[PDB]
Design a protein around this ligand. Structure first.
Ligand SMILES: *C[C@@](*)(O)[C@H](CCCNC(N)=[NH2+])NC(=O)[C@@H]1CCCN1C(=O)[C@H](N)Cc1ccccc1
Ligand SMILES: *[C@@H]1O[C@H](CO)[C@@H](O)[C@H](O)[C@H]1NC(C)=O
Ligand code: NA
Lengths: 27, 250
DNA sequence: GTCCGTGGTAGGGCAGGTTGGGGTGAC
């Protein structure tokens, strides 16, 4: 229900270093 | 992980370490899918060609962990297993078809900054995210080349088109598996390696800000070879099976 | 257009099971 939303990241509007690479590959 | 990197703290909080008690041994990775369920690869529990058939009392699970050596106090949790459930159609001889297993913990685990379950895909996650060139992220404490890292390693790898996966190996590929990795000229490198089985291949959906486990590290031929690709168990394919055993035996 | 259940990883059998769906479908 709360799955896949990381406390240290999504929850506190922070990105990890390389998640953008993943997004870009979806383009 | 080969050509990966040290993860950031809390970057993979559904990451789970699968242990042999005696002699102590880091066996495989795994993933936290709810407070009482862990996903992993069946070949980590059951592999008859090496007379490997573990019982719940042979193993121990470690969650919330970042560094492979240190006990991390008030960070990591240990769990025992109530029951193991291997897919009835798992094939250890030919091609590790359906290489998937579920583990029910004896007690549930409290979540924290460091312990948080990942989502499983439904039809739309599979429709939208399972595409050649799209990258996911794999994590593990297994081999750095074909020593062993101190800190969880992470790497991003693109899903490879299916004919290319088929052609690149003589093992009979299957609809319940996919492959991921860079083609020889694409510059970039990287792969999972032995000791990484069971770890998750996650993808962050651009539609909700959520991480989905699309794969389970399953097999390969060496690690990080040109024209070779890591193989992963197709999670969504096996979704109905996961839900049933959880529903029925949870 | 066609094809993905009768053993196989394996029993008892021709369903259905924790398991033969329907899809990144492949071909
Ligand atoms: C148990 C897992 O750690 C491991 C993962 C290896 C992943 N490798 C890459 N390059 N991404 N799996 C295995 O080691 C499996 C189980 C036993 C043998 N095996 C293999 O991958 C062999 N290398 C090849 C193989 C043999 C038999 C059937 C399928 C594949
Ligand atoms: C593995 O061990 C279990 C528990 O001992 C046993 O009941 C089962 O038949 C074994 N499976 C094998 C060897 O495939
Ligand atoms: Na490769």
């Amino acid at each position: 229900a709360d799955c896949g939303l990381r406390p240290l990241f999504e929850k506190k509007s922070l990105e990890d270093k390389t998640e953008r690479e993943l997004l870009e590959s979806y383009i | 992980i080969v050509e990966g990197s040290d993860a950031e703290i809390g970057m993979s909080p559904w990451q789970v370490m699968l242990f042999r008690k005696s002699p102590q041994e880091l066996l495989c990775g795994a993933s936290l899918i709810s407070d009482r369920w862990v996903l992993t690869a069946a070949h980590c529990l059951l592999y008859p060609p090496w007379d490997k058939n573990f019982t719940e009392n042979d193993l121990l699970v470690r969650i919330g962990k970042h560094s492979r050596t240190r006990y991390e106090r008030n960070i990591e949790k240990i769990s025992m297993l109530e029951k193991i459930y291997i897919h009835p159609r798992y094939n250890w001889r030919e091609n590790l078809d359906r290489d998937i297993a579920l583990m029910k913990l004896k007690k549930p685990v409290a979540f924290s900054d460091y312990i948080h379950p990942v989502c499983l895909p439904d039809r739309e996650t599979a429709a939208s995210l399972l595409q050649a060139g799209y990258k996911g992220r794999v994590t593990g404490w297994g081999n750095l080349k074909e020593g062993q890292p101190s800190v969880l390693q992470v790497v991003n790898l693109p899903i490879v088109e299916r004919p290319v996966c088929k052609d690149s190996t003589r093992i009979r590929i299957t609809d319940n598996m996919f492959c991921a990795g860079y083609k020889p000229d694409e510059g970039k490198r990287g792969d999972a390696c032995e000791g990484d089985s069971g770890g998750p291949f996650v993808m962050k959906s651009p539609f909700n800000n959520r991480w989905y486990q699309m794969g389970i590290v399953s097999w390969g031929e060496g690690c990080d070879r040109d024209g070779k690709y890591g193989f992963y168990t197709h999670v969504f394919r096996l979704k109905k099976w996961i839900q049933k055993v959880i529903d029925q035996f949870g």
